[PDB]
Design an enzyme around this catalytic site. Structure first.
Site, short mmCIF file in Angstrom:
data_model
loop_
_atom_site.label_atom_id
_atom_site.label_comp_id
_atom_site.label_asym_id
_atom_site.label_seq_id
_atom_site.Cartn_x
_atom_site.Cartn_y
_atom_site.Cartn_z
N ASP A 336 0.85 -1.19 0.00
CA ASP A 336 0.00 0.00 0.00
C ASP A 336 0.89 1.25 0.00
OD1 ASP A 336 -2.38 1.59 0.12
OD2 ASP A 336 -3.03 0.67 2.03
N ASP A 396 -11.06 4.16 -1.10
CA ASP A 396 -11.54 3.16 -0.15
C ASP A 396 -13.06 3.14 -0.10
OD1 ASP A 396 -8.84 2.87 0.45
OD2 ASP A 396 -9.06 3.59 2.55
#
Ligand SMILES: OC[C@@]12C[C@@H]1[C@H](Oc1cc(F)cc(F)c1)[C@H](O)[C@@H](O)[C@H]2O
Ligand SMILES: [Mg+2]
Length: 534
Positions: A336, A396
């Site tokens: 990430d 997200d």
């Protein structure tokens, strides 16, 4: 075969467009390029040397409505009105997620890698050395290759540019993406993982006690992977040091494996916080500005620095880390905040941030081997093709629709789903698309049954990765039914038919699923869907 009026109006490397072979000897650089006919359009390719800087590749009149794409996972891919564009205010803590060339974005409309209009795709096939992008500069669409002031003694390849025309815009986008996959030797796994992820129920408050509870319950669900997200680690950079009630990173893998799952783990492998052990031991390992550590972003209420991936010491540390994880039994890796590795700045070697970025991810791939699955996140898209197996392609998701969340990168189911739609054409061409996790629980959520269905069935029709993130104690009959019927919709070739829509209603078909030919019509404003299965 006449030239369209709009094609005679185009400039390639400053020259009137036409087919042929050319040489631009300019003051500080030289380019040698060819303009060649291909199926559905043209390809511009060749080689450059010297100091090309911000190199102008193409110029043409801006269209009124354009599909614009952010360089990384979380940024929007969406249709914009090109004449009424207003520069955004950029969050100084997250500058580089908005743009790797932020001087452009704060002034003019910016699209990274590709841009589209009705009937026409302009797209670069790779990002190996330069960052390829488009800007709308005073009513004109200009394609650029950014070399970040690096000098090249000998020729290096240009990133190729295609200009494709057909009235079927989704077809053009799919063709563009098949050309990218060929140029980069994309990894398209033949099997798609199912699994569980901790993040979107527990966030940073995951305990190993709650993890063990879910590990037991996960035996009742069709999960192959059990992935631990951000929570277990003591600090950003210190990936083998745990906190709270977690055991060792190796022990977590062994417990997970003893319970019959493929262990998975989250890292942010190009990031080191100001407080981390690794940073305090190795102040020299990070990208710099005027000789000092350059903040890449601020998160977790700390300044976060970028590893300098031009340094062999840094690449050996990465290799050893991911090799050490592989030995432990991890075979699924969510990596990430990768944009950090590609921030502009001072590095030990005078190479581009994209060249640095690619050495880092290539090192990770070597270390985990061909049998590990790499899921990229927070990542530059084109530079990662050929390395990652799966990629997060939206902002997200969240356990709410996000009625009061604007389209600006904050968590919201509605905007996560929009990107899964608008980037659908990357799927099974660049990698497996990850549309972010399903949230199927029926307490500790503001999602309705209909919103859960809409999100999950759209993901299945798109053939995207299906990973669930819930306290599995809170998932009952409805959530299990949604997961079951979602997995029945996988296995096809999807198309978003009206990819230029501005009202968030989309018609989506997928041929040859495990349920035959299917069609879903989804409306992200009304939160409604209509699914037909043949
Ligand atoms: O810290 C763990 C975590 C949140 C980070 C990441 O989501 C973010 C996406 C952002 F644009 C900004 C941010 F701070 C976090 C990622 O996309 C999520 O799935 C999850 O792994
Ligand atoms: Mg597939």
């Amino acid at each position: 075969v006449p030239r369209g009026s709009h094609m005679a109006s185009m400039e390639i490397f400053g020259k009137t467009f036409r087919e042929g072979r050319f040489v631009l000897k300019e003051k500080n650089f030289t380019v040698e390029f060819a303009v060649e006919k291909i199926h559905l359009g043209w390809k511009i390719s060749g080689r450059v040397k010297g100091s090309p800087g911000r190199l102008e590749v193409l110029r043409t009149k801006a269209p009124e409505k354009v599909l614009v794409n952010n360089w990384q996972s979380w940024g929007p891919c969406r249709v914009v009105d090109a004449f009424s564009f207003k520069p955004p205010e950029i969050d100084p803590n997250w500058r580089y997620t908005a743009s790797v060339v932020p001087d452009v974005l704060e002034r003019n409309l910016q699209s990274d890698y590709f841009v589209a209009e009705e009937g026409k795709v302009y797209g670069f096939l790779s990002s190996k050395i330069a960052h390829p992008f488009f800007a709308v500069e005073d009513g004109e669409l200009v394609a650029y290759l950014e070399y970040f002031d690096v000098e090249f003694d000998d020729f290096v390849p240009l990133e190729p540019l295609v200009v494709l025309e057909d009235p079927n815009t989704p077809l053009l986008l799919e063709k563009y993406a098949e050309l990218v996959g060929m140029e980069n030797n994309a990894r398209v796994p033949k099997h798609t993982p199912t699994g569980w992820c901790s993040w979107y129920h527990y966030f940073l408050d995951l305990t190993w006690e709650e993890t063990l509870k879910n590990l037991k319950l996960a035996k009742n669900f069709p999960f192959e992977v059990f992935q631990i997200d951000d929570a277990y680690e003591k600090d950003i950079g210190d990936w083998l040091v745990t906190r709270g009630d977690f055991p060792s990173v190796e022990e977590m893998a062994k417990v997970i494996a003893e319970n019959g799952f493929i262990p998975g783990i989250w890292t942010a492998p190009f990031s080191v916080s100001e407080t981390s052990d690794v940073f305090n031991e190795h102040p020299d390992w990070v990208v710099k500005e005027n000789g000092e550590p350059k903040m890449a972003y601020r998160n977790w209420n700390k300044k976060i620095y970028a590893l300098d991936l031009s340094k062999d010491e840094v690449l050996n540390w990465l290799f050893d880390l991911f090799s050490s994880l592989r030995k432990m039994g991890y075979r699924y890796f969510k990596i990430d905040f990768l944009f950090a590795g590609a921030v502009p700045g001072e590095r030990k070697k005078n190479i581009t941030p994209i060249q640095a970025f690619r050495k880092g991810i290539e090192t990770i791939r070597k270390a985990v081997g061909e049998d590990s699955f790499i899921l990229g996140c927070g990542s530059p898209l084109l530079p990662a093709v050929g390395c990652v197996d799966g990629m997060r392609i939206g902002p997200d998701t969240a356990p709410f629709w996000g009625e009061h969340i604007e389209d600006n990168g904050a968590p919201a189911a509605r905007w996560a789903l929009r990107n899964a739609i608008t980037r659908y054409f990357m799927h099974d061409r660049f990698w497996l698309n990850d549309p972010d996790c399903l949230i199927l629980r029926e307490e500790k959520t503001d999602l309705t049954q209909k919103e859960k269905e809409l999100y999950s069935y759209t993901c299945g029709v798109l053939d995207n990765m299906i990973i669930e993130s819930d306290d599995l104690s809170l998932v009952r009959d409805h959530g299990k039914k949604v997961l079951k019927e979602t997995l029945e919709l996988l296995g096809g070739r999807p198309r978003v038919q009206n990819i230029m829509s501005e009202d968030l209603r989309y018609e989506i078909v997928s041929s040859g699923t495990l349920s035959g030919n299917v069609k879903i019509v989804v409306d992200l404003n009304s939160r409604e869907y209509h699914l037909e299965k043949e």
